[PDB]
From a paper:
In all structures, nucleosomes 1 and 3 form a canonical stack, whereas nucleosome 2 is located in a DNA loop between the two stacking nucleosomes and is rotated relative to the nucleosome stack. H1 is absent from the stacked nucleosomes of the 4×177 array, but is present on nucleosome 1 in the 4×187 and 4×197 arrays, and is present on both stacked nucleosomes in the 4×207 array. Furthermore, exit DNA of nucleosome 1 shows the highest Δβ value for the 4×177 array, which is the only array in which H1 is lacking on this nucleosome. Altered linker DNA trajectories, as observed in our 4×177 array, sterically preclude H1-linker DNA contacts that are required for stable H1 binding. To confirm that our observations are not a result of low salt concentrations, we solved the trinucleosome core structure of the H1-bound 4×177 array at 60 mM NaCl and confirmed the presence of nucleosome stacks and the absence of H1 on stacking nucleosomes.
Here, we report cryo-EM structures of human H1-containing tetranucleosome arrays with four physiologically relevant NRLs. H1 binding to stacked nucleosomes depends on the NRL, whereas H1 always binds to the non-stacked nucleosomes 2 and 4. H1 contacts DNA with L1, the amino-terminal part of α2 together with L3, and α3 to stabilize the nucleosome and contribute to chromatin compaction.
Numbering used by the authors:
A (entry chain H), E (entry chain N), F (entry chain R): 30 to 124
B (entry chain M), G (entry chain Q): 10 to 118
C (entry chain P), H (entry chain L): 20 to 102
D (entry chain O), I (entry chain K): 37 to 133
Write the structure that this text describes.
């Protein structure tokens, strides 16, 4: 009998398959990716909390998430990331 | 009790009309049978092509301080990439002109 | 009604402008009538195609879309006037 | 003494001016007269949409500037700067015209 | 009123509005885009019919038009367009 | 046992004996002839197909084929072909 | 009970098969429906084309004193006719070679 | 199994023979490697198209009619190979 | 003194021979080796019908012959008799490559 520890191995493995059907992965590299996604997620989440705190907003919205994306990610990464997130939230809005 | 009419372009998450392109292949006389994924693939590839060429047109317009695209921007966009030139070697653009290009021996000392 | 001489309507300064668009530094005097001949060859080669489409369409007036077909048959496809 | 540019200077300024520009180079009405003259030689009483004329025009300057770009390349291949009729003949023959 | 002339303008407006919300459009340039999309459509459809003939296949599917895109469209756009098309057809596979 | 493969050997052979009772062929020359006739058939048929597209006619006729021949075949080859085909169409109509 | 079957090529007086070319157009995906006289016309056009090119090939072989046509003779037939060369400038013939063609400056004196 | 340097397998005298058929009487020594490059690029294009066709055929063996399809789609049509 | 022709006379002789001739000019077995070598880069374990290799050989030979006669036209255009690589780049670039 065991208790789970959650991870991002399945999702990174899938997106690896869409970007490269023919490439493999080592598990310690997947641990590196787990730390990567958790670290970036906590950075964006904490910066989002500070942005919500500055303008006295108790609700976290996609607008300040987008603000934090410009805030941390430099330039090219920021503009393209804003683009994919924008089109993604358009499909989610239409859904 | 019919379900709500939702669209295949939205089903692929894409802007180009899946139904119109599917109909246009059906009466475009390329086969008697056609698969469902082929118009999806076709709409996707044309959207990607228009997306990249419209990126190039937008940067060309902004570099010339224009907020409206002109065919001169389109010509400057297509001709400044060699791979699109291999895509468009024999294609004529109306009112496009040519690239600013002077042979080096033509220039004075 | 009838016309007999309009190849000279492509004037020598107009050919000079065309050469300046092509990046030509110096233009000989013998160039112009040759360009008139070559242009005449190309325009007749495409307009025979165009008139062929118009007579096949049972129309008397030349339409632009047929001219677009006439250029793309020789692989010189012109964009922007279809439809 | 009135100012006078050296030969080629105004030519290169023309190069830059006409190459940055997109506006038309052939006077449209003598061209349209030539088009109708050649058209009536094949079928009489042909009528022309203006856009048909325009396309016939855009295509012609496209074809010609393709020839003069080829002509410039072959001329600088020939160690000259002045184009000669044998060069246009060469360009057409290499294109298979 | 006049009978409908179907065209590809408004889709170009939507896709540009995703990639550049700010810019404007001249109409003859818009016609140049319609000529582009119709031309590429005819090229790909002709290659699709040709390959369906050569494999003696009655059906136009995504797989041979993928082959046709690898034929006509070169290199970088070819592989990326393959990527977006496979993503799209997998999304439509998920309805 | 193999599957029967289509050819134009007998028709070209009859035509050769019609124009030259005394002459033979090589098999390589016949391969060039099969490629030739298939190629010209493909060219004329596809050209007629796009003519049927352009006038929105879903029916192809010998008028369309004649238009394609006059369009594609240079010089008096076209008018000779029109004369021969016109004679053939008339004496087929009478028969 | 039934009339004697009579071939349509004999009705057109042609050597090329009306029925086969008609079937090829029907499965060639060019139109949804084909007129009756169009394959007849096309077969006549092809028959004239093969007739003239075979006449040229036979004359060229008779020049070479050979009773059977050669791909070399076919290349000689295509390239020594200007009008067929304009038809077939982009074609390649296996084992055909090229015309005997030497530039005048390449000759001595 | 692996072949490494067959680009110089197109020998210099073969290029001289091709120039003779091309009508060249005098050939520089600096010609052959660029002609190898040009042949190289052309063969890459045609066999890339050929392997694309064959991979659509789901065949491990390249066939002749696929090759001639690749040439006509590249605009260098071949006769005499089952076309 | 042993016999020796002046240069070009021999060259025109095999010009006449090879332009008269019909057979393939390049060696066969290195051509299969080369096509296998380069097709190895796109996909592994390819098998070649000999007819396909011959068709490729004829197509390559004709393409090179057309390129060479175009460079001949370029070289006689430049008033020279010896070809140089810029003739080949010129001919290809006029051709559209």
């Amino acid at each position: 009998k065991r208790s789970r520890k959650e991870s991002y191995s399945v999702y990174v493995y899938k997106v690896l398959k869409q970007v490269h059907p023919d490439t493999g992965i080592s598990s310690k590299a997947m641990g590196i990716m787990n730390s990567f996604v958790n670290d970036i997620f906590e950075r964006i989440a904490g910066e989002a909390s500070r942005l919500a705190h500055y303008n006295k907003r108790s609700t976290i919205t996609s607008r300040e998430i987008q603000t934090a994306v410009r805030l941390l990610l430099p330039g090219e990464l920021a503009k393209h990331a804003v683009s994919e997130g924008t089109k993604a939230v358009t499909k989610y809005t239409s859904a | 009790a019919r379900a709500k009419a939702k669209t295949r372009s939205s089903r692929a998450g894409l802007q180009f009309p899946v139904g119109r392109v599917h109909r246009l292949l059906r009466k475009g006389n390329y086969s008697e049978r056609v698969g469902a994924g082929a118009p999806v693939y076709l709409a996707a590839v044309l959207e990607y092509l228009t997306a990249e060429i419209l990126e190039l047109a937008g940067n060309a317009a902004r570099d010339n301080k224009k907020t409206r695209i002109i065919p001169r921007h389109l010509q400057l966009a297509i001709r400044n990439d060699e791979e699109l030139n291999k895509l468009l070697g024999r294609v004529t653009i109306a009112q496009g002109g040519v690239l600013p290009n002077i042979q080096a021996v033509l220039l004075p000392k | 009604k009838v016309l007999r001489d309009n190849i000279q309507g492509i004037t020598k300064p107009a050919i000079r402008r065309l050469a300046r668009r092509g990046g030509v530094k110096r233009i000989s005097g013998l160039i112009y009538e040759e360009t008139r001949g070559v242009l005449k060859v190309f325009l007749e080669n495409v307009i025979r195609d165009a008139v062929t489409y118009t007579e096949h369409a049972k129309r008397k007036t030349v339409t632009a879309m047929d001219v677009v077909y006439a250029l793309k048959r020789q692989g010189r496809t012109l964009y922007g006037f279809g439809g | 003494k009135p100012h006078r540019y050296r030969p080629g200077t105004v030519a290169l300024r023309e190069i830059r001016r006409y190459q940055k520009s997109t506006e038309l180079l052939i006077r449209k009405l003598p061209f349209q007269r030539l088009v109708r003259e050649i058209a009536q030689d094949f079928k009489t009483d042909l009528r022309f949409q203006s856009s048909a004329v325009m396309a016939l025009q855009e295509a012609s300057e496209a074809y010609l500037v393709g020839l003069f770009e080829d002509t410039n390349l072959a001329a600088i291949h020939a160690k000259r700067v002045t184009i000669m009729p044998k060069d246009i003949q060469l360009a057409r023959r290499i294109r298979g015209e």
